Structure formats: structure tokens, C-alpha cells
């Protein structure tokens, strides 16, 4: 962990586009990670900062970087309903079937929070609809348990 690495983590989180720009020019470590294993891309994905997700990927950020529990930026973006960031991550080669330590995928998380637009995008980029978590649950099992009629019909 470097001085500019810490500055980039804080800037990526806060959504300060202009500060990230200056930090990219000075070569702030894009693979900088905090104690839980979150990169600037993780943080930008979580808090929904589209411009910074794009700028970090341009500057050779790991699109499939995983935290200490095996969660990727696509997991975060899919879970918190950031449609534009999900599309960008998938276009820059994000593993659509990425499994965390619980066996949970972006499709599982999106299904759980009922993000219909995101579920369609994930399925479009070839998300495994039959993918089971550690409890043997699919995105379909989540849709019927949540009682989401629209979602259950799409996961046919």
C-alpha cells in the first residue's frame, strides 16, 4: 500500500472524478486494496460512480479483483442496482459467473434485490441460470421465495 493508493481508494469511494484524473496522471496504484481486499474499482462499483469505473478500467484496473470473501466489483454493482456499471464491467471482461466463498453469483444478488434490467444483462452475457450457492439455491429459487412474479417469469 502506497500514499497515492490510499488517496485513490478515498477518491474512488467519494466519487471525486477530478481528483481520480490527477491521481491516474501521477500513477496512483489501481490495484491498491484496503484490509478487506476492496480495490478502487470495488469502491466505485459499490457507491455507483460510473465515470471513475470507466477511468480505472482504462488505467488497467483488475475487472475480476476479489475481496477476502471472494466478491468482485460485478457482485457489488449487480447487488446495488447500478445497471450502467454492470454493462461497462461486462464489456471490459468481468466474469459473469464469478462465485464468492458462499457460491453466490451476480445473478443471485440481482435476483434477491429484484433488479430486472440487471438480470437480463447478466443472462445476455451468458450468466449460468442453473448456478447453485452453498445451500443449493438458484436465482429462480430466490425469485419464488421473494414472491417476485416478473423475475420468476424471466428466469424460465
Amino acid at each position: 500500500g502506497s500514499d497515492l493508493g490510499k488517496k485513490l481508494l478515498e477518491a474512488a469511494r467519494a466519487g471525486r472524478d477530478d481528483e481520480v484524473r490527477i491521481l491516474m496522471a501521477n500513477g496512483a496504484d489501481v490495484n491498491a486494496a484496503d484490509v478487506v481486499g476492496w480495490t478502487p474499482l470495488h469502491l466505485a462499483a459499490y457507491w455507483g460512480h460510473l465515470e471513475i469505473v470507466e477511468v480505472l478500467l482504462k488505467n488497467g484496473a483488475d475487472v475480476n479483483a476479489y475481496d477476502t470473501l471472494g466478491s468482485t466489483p460485478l457482485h457489488l454493482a449487480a447487488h446495488f442496482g447500478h445497471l450502467e456499471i454492470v454493462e461497462v464491467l461486462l464489456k471490459n471482461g468481468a466474469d459473469v459467473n464469478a462465485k464468492d466463498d458462499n457460491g453466490i453469483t451476480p445473478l443471485h444478488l440481482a435476483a434477491n434485490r429484484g433488479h430486472l434490467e440487471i438480470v437480463e444483462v447478466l443472462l445476455k452475457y451468458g450468466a449460468d441460470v442453473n448456478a447453485q450457492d452453498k445451500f443449493g439455491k438458484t436465482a429462480f429459487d430466490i425469485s419464488i421465495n421473494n414472491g417476485n412474479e416478473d423475475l420468476a417469469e424471466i428466469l424460465q
Binding site: 457482485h75 458462499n102 450457492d133 445451500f135
Partner: protein
């Protein structure tokens, strides 16, 4: 009335004697404290939820209590903190003048009815309702030097053998332990628990069974069988008393018949209730007592009594234990008293010298030497009657009134000495005529000065309570001075002064006093010639007056505003702030570096560093700490370079090097509740259930905009904490039910192990203390450790936590704030250099009206009080000016002549502003009260010039210029005498650099400069004012 007492000097002496005894009695019985109660009454509700996060605390404790704080009288506002230390503090602030006891009992009564709605673990810990205050009398440190005791061991010894005795000590109002009494700590091992198919649930169940009080009954209890001879109580099971007994608690009997005891699955020791704080004093383990002074108590007596009780405890102290006094106010308060008594005594000595220099007889010098003490003693008797204390504000209030008290004495005696010299009348007849000339004016002056000072007592809020201390002190001293001037002083003059033959001005004397009288008589003719010339060309002086008025107005706007000067109190604070999520050990390494700096780079200045790791003022997570620095005595720190302000700046500059840690030193404020000079306290409020995240975005939007106006706003930051990574674990209900694992067993196992659990009480050497079960550190540090905790299913199989749970990283708040029941975020800031708080607040309001839908705002603390204190000022200034005018109108029997007196105001103010500006001081409370007394004395000088002038025109039919010239001639000597005595009297306060010099400098500087100009200008300008005002109106 003066005539009455000239013929009755014994009656006069009797009145002086009664006043002296009343004052003498008051001096002995009057309370003593550094500062009186200023801040409006506040009641704090405090609750602990062991192992609870900010949201859990907020949504199960804080919201329920807040919803039940209804039907309570005189509530201004309500604010709360819920943080991830498992702590809630709700603060209810009440209208100034509210009974603090009624406020507290009303709050705790409404809480009592809300207690059944709180979680069982919160009801078990309890919910404290306390009168809020931050002023400690002193902090007693208790350390161990031979390395045989931890902070936990010292805390328990202090709690068991010291705290109660100090609480019982005379004048002690409250005592806070810096630590807890011991708890029985059961440190659980999950490997051993799983080995014998046991969980924390079984540990808790066994402790409640085998550590308990059990009711039995009596032998031969009523109603008995008739003939029963013996009646005795049956004692059954009573609470355990030792780590040995807790160790032997039976958990399981195995198939083969071997016993599983609690010591087989846990480490068992006496430890602290909490491990959040790590206290060190010069690197050595430390506890201590925070002692507050009781209402109406004498601070000096209490401090002596505390040290007397600590002395009695010395012989029983375990080896290595030692008392230290890192903070004690009473040395400072003792120096304040000494310095004030010194100033009042020097003032009386200087009046004696000036009185002899001019009047040159010892009988004259004795009259003020009697009169001034009588007034000062009388003033204490009236303070006592109003229920005031001898404090910094009331003591310096008397110092600021010295000029007014000295003048009343000098005016009466000097005028008798003149009347005798000019007319040849004997003392008694001379005193009658002399009082005849001034007695009407003295009463007029009393009413005018009442009109000036009395309205100062009716400002609301904290600043009002401060101004009220000076107002009553000064009005009382002034009021008694006039009573003594009309009763005692005339009687003393009539009976003590020797006659002076008509024409004898001591010009015929030899030596210094002959030369002086010749010089001063010659100087008086030079003065009357100058006024003669000034009065021939009054036009250019009205021009010079407006230049002064404009210069005054200009200097007023440029002079930075403040409350009370910073002081060298031999102590200051160092703040240690690490990045969010930083651990206790990382914070400890920075504090070790900060402590090492002070005992190395400032070994000459620093006596001790009190390092409190895991303590902050806006939340106490693991990434925060403070170093409380105590300095060596003032005597051993000579020069400005070795004072708190210089050490502070040096420390801050050195520590700015420290990487990944915000560290800075700062002096303590005079009174904490007033806040910073032109600071504001803003609340951003969620008014439409937006939630934490949308309110954060709104906060950032406001902060971003505030940063774009550095011309108006400076250091606009949040007071709270930023969201941090947290470990969300989801229990799969289906998997739990499938394996036959109850959710109670899962939630207890997790909570008990990782969070800790208060089970019940035991009795340690005759003292009831708490029993906590918790995981030993090494099994609750990292996410992988979650899988090492097992829960027994219905069928008896041990199921790991991994089998029925899933986890992920998310962000959440470690401290959630609420204002008047709604989610809030406190924003601090201050007006830019040259800008007023009003302007800064006006912009913040403008910026706030541009935030998203459902985001409101309010002002709190100093900002709430400023809005309500600022709106009163115009009314109080107006009432003061109107009543002054009306009193002078009644005195002079004229609507016009009053203006000639009132025009003097700027002549004093200009000198005060020049002296303050030049010396680099601020427009503070001491300076402001200084202006009123300077205005007061110059007004008094002017009143008597105009009375003498007007009387000569009315009675002796003299001309305007003739009357004015004869008036200023007669008033020259008394005006110069008062000014020479008083200026010399405040000279020590101006040059002072010792302890309490900040206050002395603030009192002295403005008064000295103000008196210099007030004296020099008024003697030339008052005659101009009178001539111009008489000409313009007939």
C-alpha cells in the same frame, strides 16, 4: 441626607460598621469556583448494549427512548449518538432558568415507562440519567511504578478503597472512575467447547444456576406450632466469590464419569468490564478519579479536603501505587484571588499617594482609605444576597469597578478641600456647601450608570449568564459607592479634615510640595487659556470629533471578536486521529511516539503525559486517542517560548510529519460550552425518511458548495464519523431448521463469543461485580474464526457456523446522529477572517435551501443561543440610551443639555480600540465590560463639569464661556487625580505575563488606553460639547 450625616457622624460610622460585618461574614461564607454555571441545563440519558452496532443501538434503544420523551417542560432541543461501541447518549437541553432537578426527574420518569420496551440486555446494564457538565475541579491519577498492577487492577483498587471516601469528602459533588471495578471474565475456547459438545449457551445456563442467591425460609417461622422454642433463618445457595469457584462450575458429566468444569473450556480471571480504553501516565498503567465541585461548595476547601483524605489512604496502598495530580484548577483560582486582592490593595495605596501628592495632608488620605474597603466589603454582602460566588468573572468585575469606587471617594474629599481653600469656610460648613454642589449629581450618576449596566444582565443564553455576573457585581459596587458618598464620606470630611485659610493653595510652601503647587497652579492657567482658545474656534473640533467617531467605527469592525482569553493553565491536549478501521495497537504506537516527544523535546516543560488510547470527543472507536499533557510549575517555565501557546505550536509542527495519523496539540478553552470565536453549529436533518445514505450524499453536496466560498466559510467539516467496512453474516433459516439448530442458540453463540454477554453478578470481597462471558481474543479476530464456533443441534450433533451462514463485506455507520427525533448530521465551521458569524450562518442557510427534497436543517448549541441573544441587543442598547437621556434630562431640567454629556462616549472607546488593536488583542467580554466602565467614568467627569457650569449660569448669572471656564478649572484636579491613580492601578495587569495574564491583559489594556484618551480628550471636548449644545438650543 449628607447634611443629616454631617451632624450625625456616629450614625454614619454605625452604617459603615454594619456594612463591614455583613461583608466580613459574606467573605467567609461565599462559595469559591473558577467559573459559575453558564450553559443552560442539559440532561444526558446514557445506555450500553454489549457487542451492539450503531444501527442495532439506534433501532432498539435510541428511537424508543426518543419517542417517549414527551410531556417534559421547557425542552429547547434533543440530540443523540448511537455508535458501534454499543453505546447511546441522548442529550436534552432545557431553557435557561429551568430547575435542573425537575428537568432530570421529568426525563428519568418518562424513561422509566419506556424501559419495558428496551432489549433485556439493555435493561440489565441500566440507563443512566445525569445532570450534564464538563468542568472538573481536578483529576486524581492513580499509577503503578513497580510493574505489578495493570490498569484493570488499579481501577478495581480505586473503586474498592478510594472512590466512595472521595464521594463522601466535604464539597465533592460527583466522582467518575477512569475505568471499571473488576468483572469475572470467562474467556471461552471454542476448540474445548466443541470437544465436549458444549456451546456458550451451556456456559451461561450453568453460571446462572451455580452463581445465584436462592431464597429459603425460617425454622419455627410464623404461623408456628404452639410450643416452638427456636426461630432461625435458613441460608440456601448464595453468590460465588472467587475465580476458583467459577473454575469448578459443572458443565457436563461424561459417559465414563469424568467431570467437565468451566476451567476446562475457558480462562477465568478478574479483569475490566471493557477493554476499549488503554490509559498510561508516562508509559505506566493508570486509572484515576474525575472530581466535580458540589453546588455552593468552596473549591479551595474541597481540594484541600480531597488531598487530606488521599493522605489517609497512603498507608494502605499496595507497593508501587502512587497518587498524581495531572489536572487541578485550585492553584490557578488561588493565584486569581491573590492577584485581585493585590490589585485592590495597590489601588488603595496609589489613591493614598495621589491624594497626598495633591492635597498634602494625611487626614485627607485616610478618608478614601476607609470608604473604598467599606464599599468593597458591602459589595460581597450583596453578591452573597444574590447567591453569587467569588469566581473569575465576579472578581474581575470588582477590578473593572475600581475606577468608579476610587472617583466617588476622591470627588467628595477634593471638592471639600477646594471650597475651604477658595472661600475659607471651616470643615463642617465647607462639607455642607461642597455636598450641596455634588449631591444631586451623585444621585444622577447612580441612575445613569444603572441605565448603562442593568440592561447588560438581561441578555439570554450562555453569554447572558456571563454578562449577568459583571452587571450585578458592578451595579452593586457602584450603588454602595454612592450611598457611602452621601452618608459616610461627608461625615468623615466634616470631622477629620483640618481648615485651609482662604487663598492658601500651598504656593508659599518650600521644597517639592511648594514647587508642585506652583507648577500645577501655573499648569491650570495654561489649561484654562487652551480651553479659552478652543472655545473661540469650536468648528474644527466638531470636525476632529467626527474623525474620532469614524476612526472608532473603523477600528471596531477590524477588531476580531472572541469570548474569554486562552490561559496558561499548566495543561493542554494532543488529539491522535488515525484512518478509519485502524486498530488499538496502531493508535498505541502513535501515542508512544507523541509521549516520547514530550518527555524528550519538552523535558524542561512537561511533567507528565496522560495517554488515553481509544477515546475521542466525537466517538471513541479503536482509531482515536488523546494525550493530556501536564506542565511543570509556572516558576520553572520562564519566557513566552516555554508557555502553553509556544509548546502547542512546536508540538503541532513536529507531529505534522507523522504519516497516516492526524496529530495536533491545542490549549484548553476558558469555558468549554461557549465554543470557538465566530464558530457555528449546523444540523442537517432527514425530514422525509430518506435514510442514512441519501442524507450522507446531501451532507457531501452541502460540504462541496461550502468549500467554494472560502471568502465567507472556513473549516466546514462534519462532527461525526464516516461509514466503514462491516461484516454482514446471513443465517440461513431453512438450513438451521433442516439440521435442528435453534436461532436463539446461533444468535447467543455468535453474540456471547464475538460481542460478550453480561450473565449475572458475583460478590468480590464484599462488593457486587459483573460476570462477563466472551471468546478469548485469538478465536474472534478474523472471518475464518467464524467457522471454528459450533452449535449443538436437537439430535446432539455439533454443527459449525459455516454450515448454516453466508457472509459479505458492506459499508455502514459506526455512529448514527439524531436531532429532535429525526436522523441528522452535525456540521461545524466558522466565519472567514473579517466576516461575522451572522454572515457565515446566512450563507449556510442559502446553500442548505439548494439540497435535495426532504433534507431540512436547524441551528444548535452556540448558534441557537446567538440567534436568540443577537435579537435582544438592539432593544437593550436602545433602553440604555433612552433611560440615560431621561435621567440627565431630570438632573439638568433640560431636553438639550443631556447631549453635552452623552457625546463623551467615543472619547474613551477610541483609546480602548487603539490599545487593543496595537497589542494584538480581541473584542472579548473583559474588553466590552471595560468600555462600559470607561464610558461610565468619562460620563461622570462630564456630568459634574456640566452641573458646575449650569449652576454658575443659573445661580451666579455668569456667561456660558465664563461658567464653562470656571467649571473645567475646578474639575481639572479631581479628574487628573482619579485618572493618575486608576491608570497606575491597571498598569500591572497590562504588563502581567504570569498565570491568568490573558484575563489581566484583556481587563487592563482596553481600560488603560481608554482612560488615557478619555482623560486627555474630555477635559478639552466636554467644554466644547456644552458650549455647542447651549448655543444651538437658545
Amino acid at each position: 441626607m449628607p447634611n443629616f450625616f454631617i451632624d450625625r457622624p456616629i450614625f454614619a460610622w454605625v452604617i459603615a460598621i454594619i456594612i463591614m460585618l455583613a461583608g466580613g461574614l459574606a467573605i467567609l461564607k461565599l462559595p469559591v469556583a473558577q467559573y459559575p454555571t453558564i450553559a443552560p441545563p442539559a440532561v444526558t440519558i446514557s445506555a450500553s448494549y454489549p457487542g451492539a452496532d450503531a444501527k442495532t443501538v439506534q433501532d432498539t434503544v435510541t428511537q424508543v427512548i426518543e419517542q417517549n420523551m414527551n410531556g417534559i417542560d421547557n425542552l429547547m432541543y434533543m440530540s443523540s449518538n448511537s455508535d458501534s461501541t454499543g453505546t447511546v447518549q441522548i442529550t436534552l437541553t432545557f431553557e435557561s432558568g429551568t430547575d435542573a432537578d425537575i428537568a432530570q426527574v421529568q426525563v428519568q420518569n418518562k424513561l422509566q415507562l419506556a424501559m419495558p420496551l428496551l432489549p433485556q440486555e439493555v435493561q440489565q446494564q441500566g440507563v443512566s440519567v445525569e445532570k450534564s457538565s464538563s468542568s472538573f475541579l481536578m483529576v486524581v491519577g492513580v499509577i503503578n511504578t513497580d510493574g505489578t498492577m495493570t490498569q484493570e487492577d488499579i481501577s478495581d483498587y480505586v473503586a474498592a478503597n478510594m472512590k466512595d471516601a472521595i464521594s463522601r469528602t466535604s464539597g465533592v459533588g460527583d466522582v467518575q472512575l477512569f475505568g471499571s471495578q473488576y468483572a469475572m471474565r470467562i474467556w471461552m475456547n471454542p476448540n474445548e467447547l466443541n470437544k465436549f459438545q458444549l456451546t456458550p449457551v451451556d456456559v451461561i445456563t450453568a453460571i446462572k444456576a451455580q452463581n445465584a442467591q436462592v431464597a429459603a425460609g425460617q425454622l419455627g417461622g410464623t404461623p408456628p406450632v404452639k410450643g416452638q422454642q427456636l426461630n432461625a433463618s435458613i441460608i440456601a445457595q448464595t453468590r460465588l466469590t472467587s475465580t476458583e469457584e467459577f473454575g469448578k462450575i459443572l458443565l457436563k458429566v461424561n459417559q465414563d464419569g469424568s467431570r467437565v468444569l468451566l476451567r476446562d473450556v475457558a480462562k477465568i480471571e478478574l479483569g475490566g468490564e471493557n477493554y476499549d480504553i488503554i490509559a498510561e501516565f508516562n508509559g505506566q498503567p493508570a486509572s484515576g478519579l474525575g472530581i466535580k465541585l458540589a453546588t455552593g461548595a468552596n473549591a479551595l476547601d474541597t481540594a484541600a479536603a480531597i488531598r487530606a483524605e488521599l493522605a489517609k489512604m497512603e498507608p494502605f496502598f499496595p507497593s508501587g501505587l502512587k497518587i498524581v495530580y495531572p489536572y487541578d484548577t485550585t492553584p490557578f483560582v488561588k493565584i486569581s484571588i491573590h492577584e485581585v486582592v493585590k490589585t485592590l490593595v495597590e489601588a488603595i495605596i496609589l489613591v493614598f499617594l495621589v491624594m497626598y501628592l495633591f492635597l498634602q495632608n494625611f487626614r485627607a488620605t485616610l478618608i478614601p482609605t476607609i470608604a473604598v474597603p467599606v464599599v468593597l466589603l458591602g459589595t460581597f454582602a450583596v453578591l452573597a444576597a444574590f447567591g453569587f460566588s467569588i469566581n473569575t468573572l465576579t472578581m474581575f468585575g470588582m477590578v473593572l469597578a475600581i475606577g468608579l469606587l476610587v472617583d466617588d471617594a476622591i470627588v467628595v474629599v477634593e471638592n471639600v478641600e477646594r471650597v475651604m481653600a477658595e472661600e475659607g469656610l471651616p470643615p463642617k460648613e465647607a462639607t455642607r456647601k461642597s455636598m450641596g454642589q455634588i449631591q444631586g449629581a451623585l444621585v444622577g450618576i447612580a441612575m445613569v450608570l444603572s441605565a448603562v449596566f442593568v440592561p447588560m444582565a438581561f441578555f439570554g443564553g450562555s453569554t447572558g449568564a456571563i454578562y449577568r455576573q459583571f452587571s450585578i457585581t458592578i451595579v452593586s459596587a457602584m450603588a454602595l459607592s454612592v450611598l457611602v458618598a452621601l452618608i459616610l464620606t461627608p461625615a468623615l470630611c466634616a470631622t477629620m479634615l483640618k481648615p485651609i485659610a482662604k487663598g492658601d493653595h500651598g504656593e508659599g510652601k518650600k521644597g517639592f510640595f511648594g514647587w508642585f503647587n506652583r507648577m500645577f497652579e501655573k499648569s491650570t492657567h495654561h489649561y484654562t487659556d487652551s480651553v479659552g482658545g478652543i472655545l473661540r474656534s469650536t468648528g474644527r473640533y466638531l470636525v476632529l470629533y467626527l474623525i474620532i467617531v469614524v476612526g472608532m467605527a473603523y477600528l471596531f469592525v477590524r477588531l476580531p471578536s472572541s469570548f474569554l482569553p486562552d490561559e496558561d493553565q499548566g495543561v493542554f491536549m494532543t488529539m491522535v486521529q488515525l484512518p478509519a478501521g485502524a486498530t488499538q495497537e496502531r493508535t498505541q504506537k502513535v501515542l508512544n511516539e507523541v509521549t516520547h516527544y514530550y518527555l524528550t523535546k519538552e523535558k524542561n516543560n512537561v511533567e507528565s503525559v496522560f495517554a488515553v488510547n481509544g477515546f475521542g470527543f466525537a466517538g471513541r472507536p479503536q482509531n482515536t486517542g488523546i494525550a493530556f499533557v501536564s506542565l511543570k510549575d509556572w516558576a520553572d517555565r520562564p519566557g513566552e517560548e516555554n508557555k502553553v501557546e509556544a509548546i502547542t505550536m512546536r508540538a503541532t509542527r513536529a507531529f505534522s510529519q507523522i504519516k497516516d495519523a492526524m496529530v495536533f496539540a491545542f490549549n484548553l478553552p476558558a469555558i468549554v460550552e461557549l465554543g470557538t470565536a465566530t464558530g457555528f453549529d449546523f444540523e442537517l436533518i432527514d425530514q422525509a425518511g430518506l435514510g442514512h445514505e441519501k442524507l450522507t450524499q446531501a451532507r457531501n453536496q452541502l460540504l462541496a458548495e461550502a468549500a467554494k466560498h472560502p471568502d465567507m466559510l472556513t473549516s466546514v467539516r462534519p462532527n461525526g464519523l464516516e461509514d466503514t467496512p462491516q461484516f454482514k453474516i446471513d443465517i440461513d433459516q431453512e438450513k438451521a431448521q433442516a439440521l435442528g439448530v435453534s436461532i436463539n442458540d446461533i444468535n447467543t453463540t455468535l453474540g456471547a463469543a464475538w460481542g460478550g454477554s453480561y450473565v449475572n453478578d458475583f460478590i468480590d470481597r464484599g462488593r457486587v461485580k459483573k460476570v462477563y462471558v466472551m471468546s478469548e481474543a485469538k478465536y474472534r479476530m478474523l472471518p475464518d474464526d467464524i467457522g471454528d464456533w459450533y452449535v449443538r443441534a436437537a439430535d446432539g450433533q455439533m454443527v459449525p457456523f459455516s454450515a448454516f451462514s453466508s457472509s459479505r463485506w458492506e459499508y455502514g455507520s459506526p455512529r448514527l446522529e439524531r436531532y429532535n427525533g429525526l436522523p441528522s448530521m452535525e456540521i461545524l465551521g466558522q466565519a472567514a477572517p473579517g466576516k461575522s458569524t451572522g454572515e457565515a450562518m446566512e450563507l449556510m442557510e442559502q446553500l442548505a435551501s439548494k439540497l435535495p427534497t426532504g433534507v431540512g436543517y436547524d441551528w444548535t448549541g452556540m448558534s441557537y443561543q446567538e440567534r436568540l441573544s443577537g435579537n435582544q441587543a438592539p432593544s437593550l442598547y436602545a433602553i440604555s440610551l433612552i433611560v440615560v437621556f431621561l435621567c440627565l434630562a431630570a438632573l439638568y431640567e433640560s431636553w438639550s443639555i443631556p447631549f453635552s454629556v452623552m457625546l463623551v462616549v467615543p472619547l474613551g472607546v477610541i483609546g480602548a480600540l487603539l490599545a487593543a488593536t496595537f497589542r494584538g488583542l480581541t473584542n472579548d467580554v473583559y474588553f466590552q465590560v471595560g468600555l462600559l466602565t470607561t464610558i461610565g467614568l468619562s460620563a461622570k467627569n462630564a456630568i459634574l463639569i456640566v452641573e458646575f457650569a449650569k449652576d454658575l449660569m443659573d445661580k451666579e448669572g455668569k456667561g456660558l464661556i465664563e461658567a464653562t471656564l470656571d467649571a473645567v478649572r475646578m474639575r481639572l484636579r479631581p479628574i487628573l487625580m482619579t485618572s493618575l491613580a486608576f491608570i497606575l492601578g491597571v498598569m500591572p495587569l497590562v504588563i502581567s505575563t504570569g498565570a491568568g495574564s490573558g484575563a489581566q491583559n484583556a481587563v487592563g489594556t482596553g481600560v488603560m488606553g481608554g482612560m488615557v484618551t478619555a482623560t486627555v480628550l474630555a477635559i478639552f471636548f466636554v467644554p466644547v460639547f456644552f458650549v455647542v449644545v447651549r448655543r444651538r438650543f437658545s
